[PDB]
Amino acid sequence: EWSPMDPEEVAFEEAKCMEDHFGNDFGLAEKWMKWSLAESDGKTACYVKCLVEALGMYDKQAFQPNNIKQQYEAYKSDNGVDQTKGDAIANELGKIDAKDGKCESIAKGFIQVNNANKGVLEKIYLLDSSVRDAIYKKNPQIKPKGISIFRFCGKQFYQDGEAAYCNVRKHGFSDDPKFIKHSNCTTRGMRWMKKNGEMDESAILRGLHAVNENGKDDVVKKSLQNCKAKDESKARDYYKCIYDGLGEQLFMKVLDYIEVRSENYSYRLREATSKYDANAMRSKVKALDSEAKC
Ligand SMILES: Nc1ncnc2c1ncn2[C@@H]1O[C@H](COP(=O)(O)OP(=O)(O)O)[C@@H](O)[C@H]1O
Ligand SMILES: [Zn+2]
Ligand SMILES: [Zn+2]
């Protein structure tokens, strides 16, 4: 089921749709980040479809006005949109064609509504820079941009420089009791574990393909299938199952790149940081060790 999303959740989902559809056209990716959605750019049609489904705007045959209303209500004290305009676009979007559910059908009505209320959707869905940043400042429990998911989780459970923490940095795993909470936080933050507590196999494979690995899909599937996990330590156990299946070297190569990208989800969509560079990763991992005082 869908529920209101915080600015980190929307930014995560937006970046995932952009990566899946931009097709190495960075100028088109730049337009999407600015929400310059124009039917006339080839790939934009199916990108909008990805975006509205991921944001809970589109479900069955047409849009869901009560989802958009729920998203507006969840952050009305911060989105800067009047109650009149809020309920307006919810109903205004829920009067769309849709019906069949094609890319060009949903994108046409979305681009049409977006241009009639420019900037309002970015505010309601917490992608507007001022709305996003104010929410982050008032909600320290949400991971903001500029800090990695592992560092954000690590600061909750470990003292900087403590031995168990530096083992996590060095080997990606720890036997100490705090690692159950930490790996639950990071596996969920990486979306390897979904909100409902179940593993997302495709999300793990995204991390492998990001570092240009290709033959290990059926290896990950077996690790998950044969894993004996108890609900008290569910994420930790699946995390260790993936660790053992891939081995430390490959597992950490995947995790290090996930960590670097988690500071700003648009990382791979800028051209200079669009390609995995194993040589550049060494100094990035070193800087993250230093940040943790390890
Ligand atoms: N919590 C977050 N964690 C990681 N990346 C985030 C988060 N929130 C937003 N982002 C990313 O931040 C990017 C914006 O970075 P930057 O362009 O320098 O900031 P701004 O919006 O001010 O331009 C967005 O495209 C989004 O992907
Ligand atoms: Zn090691
Ligand atoms: Zn096969």
Numbering used by the authors: 2 to 295
The authors write:
D7 proteins are among the most abundant components in the salivary glands of several blood-feeding arthropods and are distantly related to the arthropod odorant-binding protein superfamily. The D7 proteins act as kratagonists, binding and trapping agonists of hemostasis, including biogenic amines and leukotrienes (LT). CxD7L1 binds adenosine 5′-monophosphate (AMP), adenosine 5′-diphosphate (ADP), adenosine 5′-triphosphate (ATP), and adenosine, which are essential agonists of platelet aggregation and act as inflammatory mediators. Taken all together, we demonstrated that CxD7L1 inhibits platelet aggregation by sequestering ADP, which is released from platelet dense granules upon platelet activation promoting a stable platelet response.
To further characterize the mechanism of the adenine nucleoside/nucleotide D7 binding, we solved the crystal structure of CxD7L1 in complex with ADP. A crystal of CxD7L1 that belonged to I212121 space group and diffracted to 1.97 Å resolution was used to collect a data set. The CxD7L1 protein fold consists of 17 helical segments stabilized by five disulfide bonds linking C18 with C51, C47 with C104, C154 with C186, C167 with C295, and C228 with C242. The structure revealed that the ligand-binding site is located between the N-terminal and C-terminal domains. The residues involved in binding ADP or stabilizing the binding pocket are S130, R133, Y137, K144, K146, N265, Y266, S263, S267, and R271. The hydrogen bonds between the adenine ring and residues Y137, K144, and Y266 determine the specificity for adenine and the lack of binding to other nucleotides with other nitrogenous bases (5′-GTP and 5′-TTP). Similarly, S267 and N265 of CxD7L1 are involved in binding to the ribose, which is possible when the phosphate group occupies position 5′ but not position 3′ or the cyclic form, as shown by calorimetry experiments. R133 binds to the oxygen of the beta phosphate of ADP which may explain the similar binding affinities for both ATP and ADP while affinity for AMP is lower as it lacks the beta phosphate. The amino acids that constitute the ADP binding pocket in CxD7L1 create a strongly negative surface, showing an inverted pattern of amino acid charges that completely change the nature of the binding pockets. Moreover, the structure of the complex CxD7L1-ADP was solved, showing a different binding mechanism for a D7 with the binding pocket located between the N-terminal and C-terminal domains whereas most D7s bind ligands within one of these two respective domains.
